[PDB]
């Protein structure tokens with residue numbers, strides 16, 4: 001008949017929305033039932049009714065109460081709806097009490113599971129945005145005092161010590177409309193190509209906002225029963241790979257800025273191979289002799305870009321790749337985030353100079369590759385990444401000069417539109433620019449690009465992990481995904497068509 005115990009006042013966790021206010025993580029009022037076993041010991045004849053209302057075995061529930069007969073607090077069931085909780089409270093079983101707290105609900109479910117993340121049973125962020133912005137969303141729990149007897153029965157409220165401070169609303173950079181589009185089209189591409197995993201990243205090249213980030217396979221954060229680590233893998237930020245041919249536009253940017261190269265220059269790639277010591281550079285397509293700079297990207301001649309790299313030096317190429325964020329920390333503060341590796345040399349040997357130029361030796365993520373193409377599309381200005389809505393666009397860094405960036409934009413537009421190019425990446429009504437490639441671990445189908453080519457707004461990267469249907473080539477598997485998703489992204493954002501007659 002006299003013992004004051006402190007009780008936590010759970011705080012209302014902050015709402016998570018997309019960039020337009022569409023709900024993504026909502027704190028839902030729930031009812032948690034707990035029991036005082038000392039009072040349950042006085043009403044044993046009520047146990048089978050209480051056990052059935054809780055969905056528990058009659059004898060197993062009796063064992064649990066008997067084993068905790070000296071305790072004053074045990075959980076019965078957490079996170080019931082207010083209807084279910086009041087149904088058990090209506091039994092008037094001595095020693096059964098209720099707690100009003102909150103539990104997260106995710107309206108979009110698996111569509112944005114990896115980005116939003118999830119909380120645990122204690123309403124604590126444990127993955128994705130929920131963890132990365134946990135202190136912002138969690139608030140501060142309150143403190144209250146309650147009087148319990150020496151047999152554990154609640155008597156009265158003493159006083160409230162500290163009031164609970166609710167969490168703060170957080171608006172993400174994701175556009176839920178684009179997220180739905182990217183989710184389904186990436187899912188359709190895996191089925192059509194017989195692929196098991198993949199990622200797709202959409203970025204606003206002016207603001208650095210991540211407009212969409214989907215990974216396959218995915219999971220429903222509202223369930224998470226029998227969940228495999230394969231589905232919980234945020235591949236766009238975690239899976240590192242050699243970007244290969246997709247970084248040749250950045251080797252070309254260093255060449256165009258050195259003063260020694262122009263798009264009309266010719267490189268002899270015959271016979272499709274090149275001997276560097278014991279190492280032998282080899283192109284996939286070996287049916288070319290002379291190619292201009294655009295033809296080097298269209299044919300993806302590793303020999304052609306290696307000879308250019310030897311002429312300008314690997315340092316100029318490393319500098320461009322470093323400043324656009326390849327192999328660098330993103331600063332997003334996401335859990336499990338992997339940085340990759342951009343190797344550096346005091347004296348770049350001839351072998352490492354070539355492999356750097358056509359994308360071997362270094363490892364990046366799909367987020368880093370999208371960020372790098374965002375800077376190229378943004379007239380050479382790199383804007384830091386953001387998973388939250390950007391109202392005030394930060395002052396970027398001019399990595400590539402606007403003239404050179406504009407020249408590479410046109411070259412990548414020809415990669416998509418010229419004869420023998422990646423025509424499955426064309427967006428109807430628009431001019432699209434990009435570059436296909438393949439990453440190795442068995443392949444990874446890559447396509448990175450942006451649109452409109454003449455005035456870029458949206459950068460996109462499509463990763464398809466091991467197509468089993470036919471052809472692991474990026475121009476065949478990933479480019480059709482780019483076309484469909486970019487078309488919907490341009491329309492939803494009211495980007496005016498630049499390729500109409």
Ligand SMILES: *C(=O)[C@@H]([C@@H]1NC(C(=O)O)=C(S[C@@H]2CN[C@H](C(=O)N(C)C)C2)[C@@H]1C)[C@@H](C)O
Pocket residue numbers: 243244245246283284285298299300302358436437438439473474475476
């Ligand atoms: C770069 O990642 C590799 C090259 N990427 C490109 C590419 O995917 O377009 C070539 S593929 C080669 C050139 N074009 C042919 C094609 O696309 N079809 C016949 C459909 C095949 C290489 C794979 C580079 C590192 O080898």
